[PDB]
Design an enzyme around this catalytic site. Sequence first.
Site, PDB file in Angstrom:
ATOM      1  N   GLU A 170      -5.087 -19.967   2.776  1.00  0.00           N
ATOM      2  CA  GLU A 170      -3.705 -19.645   2.457  1.00  0.00           C
ATOM      3  C   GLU A 170      -2.715 -20.788   2.618  1.00  0.00           C
ATOM      4  O   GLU A 170      -1.676 -20.620   3.269  1.00  0.00           O
ATOM      5  CB  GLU A 170      -3.264 -18.470   3.299  1.00  0.00           C
ATOM      6  CG  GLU A 170      -4.114 -17.262   3.100  1.00  0.00           C
ATOM      7  CD  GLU A 170      -3.444 -16.058   3.584  1.00  0.00           C
ATOM      8  OE1 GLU A 170      -2.976 -16.100   4.746  1.00  0.00           O
ATOM      9  OE2 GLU A 170      -3.415 -15.093   2.791  1.00  0.00           O
ATOM     10  N   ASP A 212      -2.522 -16.557  12.179  1.00  0.00           N
ATOM     11  CA  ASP A 212      -2.528 -15.231  12.787  1.00  0.00           C
ATOM     12  C   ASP A 212      -3.685 -15.040  13.745  1.00  0.00           C
ATOM     13  O   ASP A 212      -4.328 -13.992  13.721  1.00  0.00           O
ATOM     14  CB  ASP A 212      -2.558 -14.187  11.678  1.00  0.00           C
ATOM     15  CG  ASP A 212      -2.442 -12.768  12.206  1.00  0.00           C
ATOM     16  OD1 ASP A 212      -1.717 -12.570  13.216  1.00  0.00           O
ATOM     17  OD2 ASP A 212      -3.096 -11.861  11.619  1.00  0.00           O
TER      18      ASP A 212
HETATM   19  C1  LIG Z   1       3.699  -7.581  -0.727  1.00  0.00           C
HETATM   20  N1  LIG Z   1       4.578  -8.555  -0.097  1.00  0.00           N
HETATM   21  C2  LIG Z   1       4.239  -9.018   1.211  1.00  0.00           C
HETATM   22  N2  LIG Z   1       3.258  -9.900   1.327  1.00  0.00           N
HETATM   23  C3  LIG Z   1       2.919 -10.345   2.535  1.00  0.00           C
HETATM   24  S1  LIG Z   1       1.724 -11.468   3.044  1.00  0.00           S
HETATM   25  C4  LIG Z   1       1.983 -11.441   4.737  1.00  0.00           C
HETATM   26  C5  LIG Z   1       1.427 -12.087   5.894  1.00  0.00           C
HETATM   27  N3  LIG Z   1       0.312 -13.032   5.696  1.00  0.00           N
HETATM   28  C6  LIG Z   1      -0.702 -12.484   4.814  1.00  0.00           C
HETATM   29  C7  LIG Z   1      -2.073 -13.071   4.893  1.00  0.00           C
HETATM   30  N4  LIG Z   1      -2.524 -13.251   6.156  1.00  0.00           N
HETATM   31  C8  LIG Z   1      -3.827 -13.447   6.077  1.00  0.00           C
HETATM   32  O1  LIG Z   1      -4.343 -12.038   6.300  1.00  0.00           O
HETATM   33  C9  LIG Z   1      -4.531 -11.610   7.662  1.00  0.00           C
HETATM   34  C10 LIG Z   1      -3.430 -10.731   8.102  1.00  0.00           C
HETATM   35  O2  LIG Z   1      -2.284 -10.836   7.603  1.00  0.00           O
HETATM   36  O3  LIG Z   1      -3.669  -9.877   9.022  1.00  0.00           O
HETATM   37  C11 LIG Z   1      -4.539 -12.759   8.678  1.00  0.00           C
HETATM   38  O4  LIG Z   1      -5.200 -12.306   9.844  1.00  0.00           O
HETATM   39  C12 LIG Z   1      -5.269 -13.898   8.108  1.00  0.00           C
HETATM   40  O5  LIG Z   1      -5.422 -14.892   9.153  1.00  0.00           O
HETATM   41  C13 LIG Z   1      -4.520 -14.473   7.000  1.00  0.00           C
HETATM   42  O6  LIG Z   1      -5.493 -15.160   6.179  1.00  0.00           O
HETATM   43  C14 LIG Z   1      -1.709 -14.114   6.852  1.00  0.00           C
HETATM   44  C15 LIG Z   1      -0.249 -13.697   6.869  1.00  0.00           C
HETATM   45  N5  LIG Z   1       1.895 -11.806   7.128  1.00  0.00           N
HETATM   46  N6  LIG Z   1       2.891 -10.929   7.254  1.00  0.00           N
HETATM   47  N7  LIG Z   1       3.460 -10.303   6.241  1.00  0.00           N
HETATM   48  C16 LIG Z   1       3.042 -10.523   4.958  1.00  0.00           C
HETATM   49  C17 LIG Z   1       3.556  -9.917   3.712  1.00  0.00           C
HETATM   50  C18 LIG Z   1       4.626  -8.957   3.628  1.00  0.00           C
HETATM   51  C19 LIG Z   1       4.954  -8.513   2.374  1.00  0.00           C
HETATM   52  C20 LIG Z   1       6.076  -7.491   2.136  1.00  0.00           C
HETATM   53  C21 LIG Z   1       7.009  -7.413   3.342  1.00  0.00           C
HETATM   54  C22 LIG Z   1       6.244  -7.249   4.614  1.00  0.00           C
HETATM   55  C23 LIG Z   1       5.368  -8.447   4.901  1.00  0.00           C
HETATM   56  C1  LIG Z   2       1.855 -17.987   5.564  1.00  0.00           C
HETATM   57  N1  LIG Z   2       1.453 -16.612   5.360  1.00  0.00           N
HETATM   58  C2  LIG Z   2       2.442 -15.648   4.938  1.00  0.00           C
HETATM   59  N2  LIG Z   2       2.553 -15.338   3.657  1.00  0.00           N
HETATM   60  C3  LIG Z   2       3.449 -14.461   3.219  1.00  0.00           C
HETATM   61  S1  LIG Z   2       3.857 -13.844   1.664  1.00  0.00           S
HETATM   62  C4  LIG Z   2       5.117 -12.778   2.058  1.00  0.00           C
HETATM   63  C5  LIG Z   2       5.985 -11.884   1.369  1.00  0.00           C
HETATM   64  N3  LIG Z   2       5.883 -11.732  -0.059  1.00  0.00           N
HETATM   65  C6  LIG Z   2       4.694 -12.217  -0.802  1.00  0.00           C
HETATM   66  C7  LIG Z   2       4.579 -11.658  -2.110  1.00  0.00           C
HETATM   67  N4  LIG Z   2       5.728 -12.082  -2.881  1.00  0.00           N
HETATM   68  C8  LIG Z   2       6.906 -11.513  -2.390  1.00  0.00           C
HETATM   69  C9  LIG Z   2       7.137 -11.891  -0.945  1.00  0.00           C
HETATM   70  N5  LIG Z   2       6.880 -11.195   2.058  1.00  0.00           N
HETATM   71  N6  LIG Z   2       6.973 -11.327   3.370  1.00  0.00           N
HETATM   72  N7  LIG Z   2       6.204 -12.131   4.060  1.00  0.00           N
HETATM   73  C10 LIG Z   2       5.267 -12.873   3.452  1.00  0.00           C
HETATM   74  C11 LIG Z   2       4.326 -13.817   4.079  1.00  0.00           C
HETATM   75  C12 LIG Z   2       4.254 -14.112   5.475  1.00  0.00           C
HETATM   76  C13 LIG Z   2       3.319 -15.020   5.876  1.00  0.00           C
HETATM   77  C14 LIG Z   2       3.171 -15.394   7.339  1.00  0.00           C
HETATM   78  C15 LIG Z   2       4.470 -15.209   8.075  1.00  0.00           C
HETATM   79  C16 LIG Z   2       4.959 -13.777   7.937  1.00  0.00           C
HETATM   80  C17 LIG Z   2       5.218 -13.410   6.465  1.00  0.00           C
END
Ligand SMILES: CNc1nc2sc3c(N4CCN([C@@H]5O[C@H](C(=O)O)[C@@H](O)[C@H](O)[C@H]5O)CC4)nnnc3c2c2c1CCCC2
Ligand SMILES: CNc1nc2sc3c(N4CCNCC4)nnnc3c2c2c1CCCC2
Lengths: 580, 580
Positions: free
Chosen positions: B396, B156
């Site tokens: 991560e 990201d």
């Molecule tokens: C509770 N369930 C979810 N869990 C997660 S996790 C996730 C996700 N990552 C998280 C963690 N970051 C980390 O944190 C920072 C950031 O995200 O800004 C980054 O800058 C940083 O570089 C990186 O270390 C990287 C990317 N990106 N998009 N959606 C999600 C998502 C979602 C859901 C529910 C549906 C909607 C999306």
């Molecule tokens: C590799 N970093 C990520 N990690 C995660 S984890 C999670 C999630 N959850 C997590 C909790 N358990 C239920 C499902 N839902 N949507 N997107 C994510 C998600 C994403 C990324 C980056 C791409 C965009 C979405």
Amino acid sequence: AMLYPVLTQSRLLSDLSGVWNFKLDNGKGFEEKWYEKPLKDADTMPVPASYNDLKEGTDFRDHYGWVFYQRNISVPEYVKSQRIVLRCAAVTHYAMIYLNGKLICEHKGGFLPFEVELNDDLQDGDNLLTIAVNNVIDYTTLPVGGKAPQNNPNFDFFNYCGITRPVKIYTTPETYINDITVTADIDFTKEEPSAVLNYNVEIKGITCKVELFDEEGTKLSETEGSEGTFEISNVRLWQPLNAYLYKIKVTAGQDVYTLPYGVRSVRVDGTKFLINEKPFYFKGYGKHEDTFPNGRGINLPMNTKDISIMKWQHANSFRTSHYPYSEEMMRLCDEEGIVVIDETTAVGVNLQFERIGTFDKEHGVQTQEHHKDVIRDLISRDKNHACVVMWSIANEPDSAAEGAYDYFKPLYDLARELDPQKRPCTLVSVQGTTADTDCSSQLSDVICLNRYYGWYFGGPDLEVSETGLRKELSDWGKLGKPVMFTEYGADTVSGLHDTTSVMYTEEYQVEYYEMNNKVFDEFDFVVGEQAWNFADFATSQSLLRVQGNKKGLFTRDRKPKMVAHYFRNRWSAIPEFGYK
Amino acid sequence: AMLYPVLTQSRLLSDLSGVWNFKLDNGKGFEEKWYEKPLKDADTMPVPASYNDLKEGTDFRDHYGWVFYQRNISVPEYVKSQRIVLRCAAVTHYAMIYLNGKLICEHKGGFLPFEVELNDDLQDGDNLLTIAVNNVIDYTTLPVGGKAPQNNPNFDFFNYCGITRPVKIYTTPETYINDITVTADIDFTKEEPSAVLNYNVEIKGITCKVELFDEEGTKLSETEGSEGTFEISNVRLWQPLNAYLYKIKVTAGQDVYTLPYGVRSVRVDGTKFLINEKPFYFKGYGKHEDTFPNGRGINLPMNTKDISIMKWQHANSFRTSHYPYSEEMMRLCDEEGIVVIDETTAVGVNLQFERIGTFDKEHGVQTQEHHKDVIRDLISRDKNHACVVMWSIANEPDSAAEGAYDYFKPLYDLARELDPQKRPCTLVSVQGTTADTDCSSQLSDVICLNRYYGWYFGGPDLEVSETGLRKELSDWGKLGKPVMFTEYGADTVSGLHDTTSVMYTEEYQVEYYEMNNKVFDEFDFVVGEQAWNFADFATSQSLLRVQGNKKGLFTRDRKPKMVAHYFRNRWSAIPEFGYK
Ligand SMILES: CNc1nc2sc3c(N4CCN([C@@H]5O[C@H](C(=O)O)[C@@H](O)[C@H](O)[C@H]5O)CC4)nnnc3c2c2c1CCCC2
Ligand SMILES: CNc1nc2sc3c(N4CCNCC4)nnnc3c2c2c1CCCC2
Ligand SMILES: CNc1nc2sc3c(N4CCN([C@@H]5O[C@H](C(=O)O)[C@@H](O)[C@H](O)[C@H]5O)CC4)nnnc3c2c2c1CCCC2
Ligand SMILES: CNc1nc2sc3c(N4CCNCC4)nnnc3c2c2c1CCCC2
């Protein structure tokens, strides 16, 4: 004379930039010998950079007086062979160099380079370098500190100080190159113009030969002579937005230095500012060496970003506003083809806003001697820059006061005589002067106005303001000389918007410039439009400054206000040449 | 092994930074021999700096492939005496050095230093240096390029490339110092703790003696031995927000190099992260080498500004987020007493978000070999930094997938064995893992979570989000280990405000952190709170990125959001030590 330190087979270059030790003087600093021992309870401070904004609280930002930079130095004995020199490109205000505890150099003037040799106090092992910097400004400094324990600038930018530009260590053969000078004569007559360049090398401490190359390193001519000449038929003329730079290798006594150079002619003719015998039109703005949190510190990346934005915007020129800029930026405009108006530190030479008059000789300003040393040091530094087409002796002096003419003529003269290219001289006129009242009408080749019809004058009534600007500019034409506006603008907070504009709104800013630009376009002797300012910059606090100066076309971080898109469209439909 | 180039009586240092020639590869670049001749129709480009934002249009910003940096070089023959070396502190992604037209070095890895010697291709006169840089990212790069002609980061932040950090030229005696190592044992038992440091010098190409000084240059002990020791009673222990750095002069065979060093102990004990045998509590944030328009380029002034803001805010630590930071910043935290979590380029080792699994060995990632060379190169570089208290193998990864444990154990092992100080090892866990499912529960000394209860999870329902965060964090405690949050935050557009908060408002951001901070404070095994992010930074475009990542406590230009004043008040009431 000051050549730009570079890396040559004959000379080495080692940058001292980095995190130095640093302490704010507490008054007792010089008493105790801080410049002798290593600073104790010191702070960290990057160099090169202004130190005001690099810490928190008003105590750094608003310090009155001295600060102490301190760093350790160590050269390889195998170097004592050659000459060792310390070049300080700029210490804002007063500098005082100590080595191992002894003063070695002293300087006045915050925006021009100065050097000192080290061969005979450079000890063996680790040496304690100390640079003490003073920020106090007064009627004896350029720029001019006003009366209103605190510095009060008589100029509209913040008083950033510290080691503003870099400190390096270069070396040389014992007898060395010290100042190369080159001028050009072009014979536009021929359908394939050619040119003859005049060399003038200088040494100190033997044979000296000159090599001439082209853009790509192709040699094309050679000669010998510390004052010889050179011939170039079918010459590639440096041109605005179309730079061509030849190069020049001066080999002389085990010492060689290289210099780029562009061939172009500057000449005023009636109401025409001519570059390579063509009627130029300035497009651009007044700028400021101002970035966050660097202060006035040097900023190579923003330099390139600023020049990228200018080409995006279809500009061709800028003015070193209120002080000479870094050598790096000057060379960059050479490479990139940016017309530059090089300007001195002489701002605030005006006490108008019992009453003392500006040029009273007991109670008014005491700047003329230093003003002269600046004109000389500056022209010595930038004489060979094709980008420089004009000199600015001072920004907004009380040029219509008594004493005025007497003050400036000795400086115009010194300028007109020390420029090997005899380039146009000017000074930038404040609001209030007129053709009849302005000592610039006589001394200057180009009339450069700073007018604010639509802001200070007449705002928010743009009709009344237009009537005023037509009236004044009309009169300025009677001098039969080229007149360009070097400042006009309106304070605009990025983000404030309205359909029916109010002042400070991006819409009011665009309308302001439409009115002024309409009137400018009525007079064929207007040869230039330069907006103030290129980008929002820091000033001293006051009720009239909305967290600094907000007259930029761009924000302090270079993002465009709506007006930046207005100019880009306008300047794209206006040529560098022949607009009239 | 890579020592930080400095100026010593034995070694010289000359920076090559400045405006270099620069051309975007058009595909035909390598075919034709651009690295042979001087680039033609070149562009200007400051070095050191990322080049993406330094020009206009998407063509620079979004270039796929190679670029060519090119600059001329020239050393004084009187130097061939000593060894000549070219140190590239960081070329983002792949580097390829050509001199006079011949390849001299090649490197993979955009964030760590690499050198090459010049003695035997360094011609006389002016040499054509060429650095070609590649920005392509894939399953074989760390960081990891995803599948979604364009780079698609599986991480990201924006894919800033170019000569990210400086390029210098230093020299050395023929037999030279190559790697100094120092460790410490402290006997806190005595009411006046003392310490014994173990030296371990290394040479290549004779007598070698070690001098030990104190803060002010006072010598205090000497010895001889390429592997000797040293004793220091009444030792000044480096401490968070209270740095004490001794210095060390290794004179060995006409070569001397100096090194600062701080004496402190790091040790985990149960649910306590101990520094100098005391229960520390991390306060701070995850950061990014991200400024405008520098890109990921080095920025000494902002480095000092960032550290000034941290002290203003009452923070004590930061994590080199997603890549090792510059050596300058690392030394600065030593001087300033900032606890640092040093982290590798290993982000995007996770394909979760027929389906390929992360650690499939034909179709998944191909990074483990390089991941190892990074762990070694990084620990070789920063081993002697008192600020480094912990290592982060990866940000991560899909750490709860099959193949996961097998991938990381060889890397944890390599890390635990190559750190002369045997410092704690970790990896930062993504949302989704749990104590039972996370291969980090076994391999890591500290559990480091990135949780987003209140944003991705549960936002805008902060009640439901609190219930989730209590539930998950509660479970994490069963491991009886220290757990700190290395990321939590909410995207907030500076300026958007409301009395009844909505997401993206400065008020919603403050509330988010109040809820998370309340729950954190319930568990005595939580030893750290580090918010994401310190400041707004650039990312690739997408519907979920409001002109980049807006999770900063500060804007990209370091101005505080309301939340920055919330933390400053909270952190001011929380000690470095004994919070539990
Ligand atoms: C509770 N369930 C979810 N869990 C997660 S996790 C996730 C996700 N990552 C998280 C963690 N970051 C980390 O944190 C920072 C950031 O995200 O800004 C980054 O800058 C940083 O570089 C990186 O270390 C990287 C990317 N990106 N998009 N959606 C999600 C998502 C979602 C859901 C529910 C549906 C909607 C999306
Ligand atoms: C590799 N970093 C990520 N990690 C995660 S984890 C999670 C999630 N959850 C997590 C909790 N358990 C239920 C499902 N839902 N949507 N997107 C994510 C998600 C994403 C990324 C980056 C791409 C965009 C979405
Ligand atoms: C029409 N009658 C007036 N004429 C003028 S002139 C003036 C004034 N100077 C102008 C010129 N600048 C120059 O322009 C820039 C700027 O001002 O932003 C500076 O940044 C830049 O450094 C400098 O070169 C320096 C300062 N400052 N304040 N008020 C006025 C004022 C006023 C009135 C009417 C009453 C209200 C005030
Ligand atoms: C030295 N720079 C200035 N120059 C000027 S000129 C003018 C003015 N005008 C000019 C037009 N003639 C009628 C009176 N009114 N108020 N302030 C000013 C004014 C100021 C400054 C700086 C200090 C603040 C005010």
